[PDB]
Amino acid sequence: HMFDVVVIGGGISGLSAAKLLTEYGVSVLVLEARDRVGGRTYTIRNEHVDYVDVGGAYVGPTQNRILRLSKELGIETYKVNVSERLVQYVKGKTYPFRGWNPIAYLDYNNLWRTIDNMGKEIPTDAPWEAQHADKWDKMTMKELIDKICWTKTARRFAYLFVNINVTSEPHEVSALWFLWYVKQCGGTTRIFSVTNGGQERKFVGGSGQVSERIMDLLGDQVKLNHPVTHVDQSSDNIIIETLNHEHYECKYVINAIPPTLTAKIHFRPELPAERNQLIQRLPMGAVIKCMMYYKEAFWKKKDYCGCMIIEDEDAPISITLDDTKPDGSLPAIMGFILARKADRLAKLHKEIRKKKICELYAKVLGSQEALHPVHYEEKNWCEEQYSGGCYTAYFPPGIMTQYGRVIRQPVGRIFFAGTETATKWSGYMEGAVEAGERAAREVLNGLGKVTEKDIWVQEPESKDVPAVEITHTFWERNLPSVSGLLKIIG
Ligand SMILES: *[C]C1=C([C])[C]=[C@@]23C(=[C]1)N([C][C]([O])[C]([O])[C]([O])[C]OP([O])(=O)OP([O])(=O)O[C][C]1O[C](N4[C]=NC5=C4N=[C]N=C5[N])[C]([O])[C]1[O])C1=NC(=O)[N]C(=O)[C@@]14=N2[C@]43#C[C]N([C])[C][C][C]OC1=[C][C]=C(Cl)[C]=C1Cl
């Protein structure tokens, strides 16, 4: 009933921290509100699908921490199929293996250039200290996207891309924020890897194993069905309180739930206003994740690796990967219904999306078989109580530089982790682990077992999944823009 350090929440994060404090031999205790551990990663396990993930799914080069961690728990990885052509759906026509207009294409590549080149000036660790932090944060992704682009086409492309990447609509998010986000993932090419093929990987057996495996290492030290609702940090013995009125006592809390639900807690004494805001004012993105299963892998039969970037207003699925199991079994297709459409289509009955979707995929892969699915799993994170959304927190304009600077500041004995508070790959599981270990080492450092300078450990690049530093073609760097080519006439 009494402990060294509590961790509130049992996602990849609060768990990464629990294991690490354990490593050192500190009494840990992890209260998670759900029946399960795993949070935004969640592995529905049923005889129709064997395993299938419904949240955190894809790992990739430079995401060493999670790769490291998962490997150690005894979890293997595998490559996501992209051998065959990539479908492009627009104007109601299909294009295989695709990113045709020049001045568009200028606008295209110059956009994505200006995004990276623009990002160079952003301090991953304190993005609100970029040079133009005040001007970009006041701006919106759309405004900027608009400024950068002259073609619709590419301006459009920009859009789902914001959508695809932070499950949110452009007009909603900071300019600065997006920029810093695509940055701290290592910038366009990392974030949206694979143009005529590349590297996404899934954990074999579903990534919910990462969390589960740890819950073993801890065993009874993880209490489930335990929402935390008060954290009276007053006297030298912290008193945490839960929903069911089960108290606990400790010397270090660690908040590991995300910032909205953090916001939901009663801390006595109050978190200081500066942050108390920042917590209220971050929202979570919008996504439905959608498994279509098939008997036959048909889309392969047709010469599509089973992946389509679909850019048409009514289509429900925005983006698609293949989700066939590693060993050829259970052919499938994994889509994303997201952002604004995710709010639009979540009001619907399961069996009505399932149709809508199928009839899209139908007219895209051009194969009637699409009309005849065999199973359909979906998960709607809009409608998660203990997550608010997927993938992450996101930043509405001006918030970043107004309160942003807190995000992760330790208050009292209540340190803060969770993929929000990450620095590298923040928003993804990789970032989850980053935060947990960090928070842990803080508590740890406060106990003495770790140094100050010791609290931010670098991350040896997995010898297993080795990231390759990018490459930018001549013309990539040296073609004009529309903005430009005019001053060339002009
Ligand atoms: C959902 C999702 C999705 C759908 C997707 C995705 C995701 C998700 N992600 C994200 C992740 O997951 C995150 O990051 C994490 O996981 C988070 O974690 P954490 O930190 O730990 O947090 P959480 O989990 O939530 O936990 C927390 C906890 O706590 C608790 N609570 C609450 N409240 C409370 C509590 N306790 C006590 N008390 C109280 N009061 C709860 O229970 C919980 O549990 C991800 N990630 C990664 O890494 N990966 C992936 O994949 C993922 N996914 C994403 C996505 C992405 N995307 C889509 C983009 C990229 C890729 O894409 C692509 C590419 C290519 C192509 Cl072709 C296509 C596509 Cl699409």
**Contact predicate 49/292, CB 8 Å:** no
Overall CATH class of domain 101-192:
mainly alpha
Q: Which CATH architecture has domain 40-60+77-100+193-203+283-395?
A: Alpha-Beta Complex (3.90)
Output the residue whose Cα is nearest ligand 1's atom 70: 319
Q: What is the dihedral of CA 318, 324, 325, 330, to 10 degrees?
A: 120
- Write down the residue that tokens 């998962």 correspond to: 70
Element (H, E) at 205: none
Q: Are strands 304-310 and 85-90 parallel, antiparallel or unpaired?
A: parallel
Instruction: Give the residue among 394, 452, 400 at the shortest CA–CA distance from 123.
Output: 400
Strand partners, 330: none
Q: Which atom of ligand 1 is nearest to the CA of 13?
A: 21
Strand partners, 89: 94, 310
CA dihedral for 250, 253, 256, 262, sign (positive or negative):
positive
Q: Domain locations in the chain?
A: 1-39+61-76+204-282+396-456, 40-60+77-100+193-203+283-395, 101-192
CA 78 to chain centre: 19
Euclidean distance between CA atoms 30 and 11, whole angstroms: 10
Euclidean distance between CA atoms 5 and 26, whole angstroms: 8
Going from the Cα of 56 to the center of ligand 1, the distance in angstroms, rounded, reads 5
377's tokens: 């799993």
Instruction: Indicate the residue type of 292.
Output: M
Euclidean distance between CA atoms 148 and 115, whole angstroms: 9
C-alpha dist (Å) from residue 393 to 1, 31, 49, 168, 291: 33, 21, 30, 10, 24
Instruction: Give the residue among 393, 456, 443 at the shortest CA–CA distance from 415.
Output: 443
313's tokens: 């207003």
Going from the Cα of 374 to the center of ligand 1, the distance in angstroms, rounded, reads 27
Euclidean distance between CA atoms 180 and 178, whole angstroms: 5
Euclidean distance between CA atoms 369 and 302, whole angstroms: 12
- Write down the residue that tokens 């143009």 correspond to: 195
Q: What does the DSSP assignment read for 340-406? A: HHHHHSSSS-HHHHHHHHHHHHHHHHT-GGGGS-SEEEEEEGGG-TTT-SSS-B---TTSTTTTTT-
Give strand ranges (E) for 228-282.
228-232, 238-242, 248-250, 253-255
User: Is there a cis peptide before residue 269, judged by omega within 30 degrees of 0?
Assistant: yes
Output the residue whose Cα is nearest ligand 1's atom 1: 55
Instruction: Give the residue among 353, 381, 315 at the shortest CA–CA distance from 53.
Output: 381
274's tokens: 């500066």
Q: Which residues line ligand 1 (CB under 6 A)?
A: 8-14, 31-34, 39-41, 55-58, 165, 194, 200, 227-228, 256-258, 261, 287, 289, 307, 319, 321, 336, 381, 386-387, 390-391, 418-419, 427-430, 432
Strand partners, 223: 31
- Residue 469 gets which letter from DSSP? -
Q: Which fold has domain 1-39+61-76+204-282+396-456?
A: FAD/NAD(P)-binding domain (3.50.50)
Euclidean distance between CA atoms 82 and 86, whole angstroms: 8
**Contact predicate 177/400, CB 8 Å:** yes
